[PDB]
Design a protein around this ligand. Structure first.
Ligand SMILES: *[C@@H]1O[C@H](CO)[C@@H](O[C@@H]2O[C@H](CO)[C@@H](O)[C@H](O)[C@H]2NC(C)=O)[C@H](O)[C@H]1NC(C)=O
Ligand SMILES: *[C@@H]1O[C@H](CO)[C@@H](O)[C@H](O)[C@H]1NC(C)=O
Ligand SMILES: *[C@@H]1O[C@H](CO)[C@@H](O)[C@H](O)[C@H]1NC(C)=O
Ligand SMILES: *[C@@H]1O[C@H](CO)[C@@H](O)[C@H](O)[C@H]1NC(C)=O
Ligand SMILES: *[C@@H]1O[C@H](CO)[C@@H](O)[C@H](O)[C@H]1NC(C)=O
Ligand SMILES: *[C@@H]1O[C@H](CO)[C@@H](O)[C@H](O)[C@H]1NC(C)=O
Ligand SMILES: *[C@@H]1O[C@H](CO)[C@@H](O)[C@H](O)[C@H]1NC(C)=O
Ligand SMILES: [Zn+2]
Lengths: 240, 244, 199, 199, 48
């Protein structure tokens, strides 16, 4: 079951500038003291990005997934739970599910009967789906999660779902602080599912401020700088 | 395969296999199986081709009904319980099961459908338990004249002949779709050598040269290195995680 | 169109499925009797044979409303013709019961044939004392006395039942539309509808 | 001639001799068609020429069952009563030939048979099978006129002896009256066993 | 209408278990029993 909640107050979400973040390693190749230029779907520097707030007022919009999504969160107390991907997000089509519950992470490809407001209930209550006909995939591994910043890039090409991530300590209620941090590859799954929209999951306080941002990836050309150790330290957008 | 019980003739259990490496070598190199027929492929080299999904159907039929399960064959069990399409990409495996499925006095735990309105469509399971009727006059839900029940039991006893003895049949179907392949055969790997001009195939990265120890510090996810000239000058062994 | 043959085929399939198991465990039980005769064994042979005969009689009844002219195939016609036969039940109950009780009489006392030697010191039966006398002998008087003694006794009691048995067999023969008992036994070599390969 | 051996069930399940655990059995060689691919074979066979021939009969007469075992259950029989019982006997005919025993090791490689030695084999098999053919035919003639009604009812047993004088060529030693029943001396008569099957 | 007959034309055969490839214009006439396993056939048909 799922509780229909309408206690939130309707507010117009703010916007932010994604200054430099959004760089990931394009290929599985080691380079030292070399400047390399590549063409791939990246997030343009100084880009228009949305803003969402949790904790009161909260919101879980069904944002589109057109060509890739840059996901970041500087929140605390691991309010962020997971994501849902798919085309219709109901029982007639397959949907991708990723949650980080109290003990483990669950990755499934099932035609869930998603409720309109997925929500996780100390104690937790799984209240995001109702049914599951048959799942063609499963996977369990290490969880992905003064404040802590978690950045993610979700790419889905040629039937492969790719995930990159990077964790770094952050302070203050500032949004998207300046700096550089490359996103190392984390997980690759050969599901082969169409994805058009996605939604995030949080947990109610009773029955800790959380904020997250959503970017978008576009075909661009970048110039990445490699140090001698093999780490990407700086990058240049070739059409800024 | 190594299962205690098998499904009924009319109701065949189907299991999907994916995302694992399949060692077929144990199958066709085993002499215990009495029937090993592969359609569309060869038992050898079969562990060199990749599919996306594999389906396994299990049931127990008669000794004379093993030849009845094949593309194009006709009969009672084949037409009305489990019918195979004319095209087939897989193998049919069957072996004698007298020691397990035969019991003194008759083993009547297995049922089957003998008469149906039409032959079953390929890869279709029929579990309907309805009073059949071959007469124009309806019997109105009770067995009467021209109204007979189509499901009867099998009798397995230790004294029957091999032609009537129980046989367990597993049908493996390899299907391929427009999705990344998930099932493949094992990748044989040889021992590595160093300080000798040899031909190397490092996880699909073929080449020729001399492999020595390395002082480079690869990142944990990186696999092979490259120079300014975009030529492979370093690599990491898939088995031992050291740089060469 | 629902030709009768299309339902008689299902009936024959059911008959085959039942009768195969019936005779198979009956024959499996039959083997256990020849190799082991006890009080339990004879009882279960009696039960199995009674059940098999009853089932065959029910199927003979069920074959009746499906006629023989509705099947054109000679081979399929043979199966129904063999199955359609009922037996002695065609006459009234009293005559059938007297048949069964007469057949019982020829089962019990008939097997107890005895002969009396002129000298009381030797007593021999048909198996094997008499058989030696008729077959394994080189004299005249022993064969003569054996013939006289055996035939003197058995004829008197056993003669009257034969005529009643013959007339009753004739009455069942007429009941099945046969001219006589000879035609009842002469029907095993009749071929009709095959053509010139007939008898 | 292409015929295979008995199934594997013969080797283990079937016993080639009488068991000696105190159980008494029927020692007559028997032909069993249990069905469902299950076949078992019983006789108290011995190392004798007569048992040597009955072993081939029991092996070969069962082979008829294997020939039509692919036929439907109601068609898993011989052509008629005589075909099944004649297939088995002709098998042992070849097994008793001098050449077969010479090539099988039962006869010396230099063994020569004399035409006088052949004379015994004729009389033996005639006396066993052929000598009763006129007797069997004319006895069945007697039954047929008994069945046809040619013989009047009041002389049913006395014409058996009356035509015996001229036609059967056998003279009775002492005439008997109407109360006597010579056929009652045979156990098969009371159980309704046909006699044309042998012919 | 010449080779195929109602009774059945079974005089035409083809080699299928060669175990190797064919060079251009190669003639293979050996009919020895193919072995698909480690156990030698030894002139008898059977597993592999
Ligand atoms: C692959 O599996 C083998 C099977 O045991 C692992 O074993 C290694 O074997 C090598 C030499 O045979 C040793 O030097 C290692 O110390 C063994 N490792 C362990 C953990 O026992 C091997 O580690 C496995 N390789 C990987 C990359 O997991
Ligand atoms: C981009 O973000 C800034 C921040 O407020 C602002 O210009 C506006 O919200 C965004 N631009 C749009 C939506 O065109
Ligand atoms: C978390 O998920 C695991 C399965 O991955 C389950 O066993 C456990 O009960 C779950 N815990 C909660 C609090 O939902
Ligand atoms: C209550 O939830 C159900 C589930 O979809 C649906 O009727 C609707 O989303 C909710 N009703 C409202 C918001 O009035
Ligand atoms: C899984 O569920 C879908 C419904 O979305 C159905 O079409 C499909 O046949 C199911 N697969 C299995 C193996 O049950
Ligand atoms: C996925 O989308 C592609 C085109 O974008 C289409 O060809 C394909 O049929 C779709 N598959 C499903 C399962 O929706
Ligand atoms: C390079 O990596 C080594 C090994 O950890 C470390 O000692 C060194 O400080 C690193 N140098 C730079 C510039 O990152
Ligand atoms: Zn015989």
């Amino acid at each position: 079951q799922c509780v229909n909640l309408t206690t939130r107050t309707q507010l117009p979400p703010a916007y932010t500038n994604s200054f430099t973040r959004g760089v990931y390693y394009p290929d599985k190749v080691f380079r030292s003291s070399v400047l390399h230029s590549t063409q791939d779907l990246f997030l343009p520097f100084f880009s228009n990005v949305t803003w969402f707030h949790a904790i009161k007022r909260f919101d879980n919009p069904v944002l589109p997934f057109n060509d890739g999504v840059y996901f970041a969160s500087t929140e605390k107390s691991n309010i962020i739970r997971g994501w849902i991907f798919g085309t219709t997000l109901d029982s007639k089509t397959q949907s991708l599910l990723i949650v980080n519950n109290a003990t483990n992470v669950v990755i499934k490809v099932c035609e869930f009967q998603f409720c309109n407001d997925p929500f996780l209930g100390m104690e937790s209550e799984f209240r995001v789906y109702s049914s599951a006909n048959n799942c063609t995939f499963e996977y369990v591994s290490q969880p992905f999660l003064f404040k802590n910043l978690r950045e993610f890039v979700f790419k889905n090409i040629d039937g492969y779902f790719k995930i990159y991530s990077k964790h770094t300590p952050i302070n203050l209620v500032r949004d998207l602080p300046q700096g550089f941090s490359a996103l190392e590859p984390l997980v690759d799954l050969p599901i082969g599912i169409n994805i058009t929209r996605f939604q995030t999951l949080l947990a109610l306080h009773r029955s800790g401020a959380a904020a997250y941002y959503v970017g978008y990836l576009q075909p661009r050309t970048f110039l990445l700088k490699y140090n001698e150790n093999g780490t990407i330290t700086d990058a240049v957008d070739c059409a800024l | 395969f190594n299962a205690t019980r098998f499904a009924s003739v009319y109701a065949w259990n189907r299991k999907r296999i994916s995302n694992c490496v399949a060692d077929y070598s144990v199958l066709y190199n085993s002499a215990s199986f009495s029937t090993f027929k592969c359609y569309g492929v060869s038992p050898t080299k079969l562990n060199d081709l990749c599919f996306t999904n594999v389906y396994a159907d299990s049931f127990v039929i008669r000794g004379d009904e093993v030849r009845q399960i094949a593309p194009g064959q006709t009969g009672k069990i084949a037409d009305y319980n489990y019918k195979l399409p004319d095209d087939f990409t897989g193998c049919v495996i069957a072996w004698n099961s007298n020691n397990l499925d035969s019991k003194v006095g008759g083993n009547y735990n297995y049922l089957y459908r003998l008469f149906r309105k039409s032959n079953l469509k390929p890869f279709e399971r029929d579990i309907s338990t309805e009073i059949y009727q071959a007469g124009s006059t309806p019997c109105n839900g009770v067995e009467g004249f021209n109204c007979y029940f189509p499901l009867q039991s099998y009798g397995f006893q230790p004294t029957n002949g091999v032609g009537y003895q129980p046989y367990r049949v597993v049908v493996l179907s390899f299907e391929l779709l427009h999705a990344p392949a998930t099932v493949c055969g094992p990748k044989k790997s040889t021992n590595l050598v160093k300080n000798k001009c040899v031909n190397f195939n490092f996880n699909g990265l073929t080449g020729t040269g001399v492999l020595t120890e390395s002082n480079k510090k690869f990142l944990p996810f990186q696999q092979f290195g490259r120079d300014i000239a975009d030529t492979t000058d370093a690599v990491r062994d898939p088995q031992t995680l050291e740089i060469l | 169109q629902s030709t009768t043959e299309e339902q008689a085929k299902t009936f024959l399939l059911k008959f085959d499925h039942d009768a195969e198991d019936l005779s198979y465990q009956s024959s499996l039980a039959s083997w256990n009797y020849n190799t082991n005769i006890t009080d339990e064994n004879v009882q279960k042979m009696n039960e199995a044979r009674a059940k098999w005969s009853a089932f065959y009689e029910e199927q003979s009844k069920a074959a009746k409303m499906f006629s023989l002219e509705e099947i054109q195939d000679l081979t399929l016609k043979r199966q129904l013709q063999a199955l359609q036969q009922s037996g002695t039940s065609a006459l009234s109950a009293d005559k059938s019961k007297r048949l069964n009780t007469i057949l019982n009489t020829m089962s019990t006392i008939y097997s107890s044939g005895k002969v009396l030697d002129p000298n009381t010191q030797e007593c021999l039966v048909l198996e094997p004392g008499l058989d030696d006398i008729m077959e394994n002998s080189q004299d005249y008087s022993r064969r003569l006395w054996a013939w006289e003694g055996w035939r003197a006794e058995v004829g008197k009691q056993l003669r009257p039942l034969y005529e009643e048995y013959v007339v009753l067999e004739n009455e069942m023969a007429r009941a099945n539309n046969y001219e006589d008992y000879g035609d009842y036994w002469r029907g095993d070599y009749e071929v009709t509808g095959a053509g010139d390969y007939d008898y | 001639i292409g015929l295979p051996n008995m199934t594997q069930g013969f080797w283990d399940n079937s016993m080639l001799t009488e068991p000696g655990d105190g159980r008494k059995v029927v020692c007559h060689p028997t032909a069993w068609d249990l069905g469902k691919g299950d076949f078992r074979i019983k006789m108290c066979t011995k190392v004798t020429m007569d048992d040597f021939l009955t072993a081939h009969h029991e092996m070969g007469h069962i082979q008829y069952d294997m020939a039509y075992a692919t036929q439907p259950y109601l068609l898993r029989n011989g052509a008629n009563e005589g075909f099944h019982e004649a297939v088995g006997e002709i098998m042992s005919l070849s097994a008793a030939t001098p050449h077969y025993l010479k090539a099988l090791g039962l006869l010396p490689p230099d063994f020569y048979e004399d035409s006088e030695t052949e004379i015994n084999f004729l009389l033996k098999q005639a006396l066993t099978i052929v000598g009763t053919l006129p007797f069997t035919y004319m006895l069945e003639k007697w039954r047929w006129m008994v069945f046809k009604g040619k013989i009047p009812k009041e002389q049913w047993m006395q014409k058996w002896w009356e035509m015996k004088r001229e036609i059967v060529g056998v003279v009775e030693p002492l005439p008997h009256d109407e109360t006597y029943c010579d056929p009652a001396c045979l156990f098969h008569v009371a159980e309704d066993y046909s006699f044309i099957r042998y012919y």
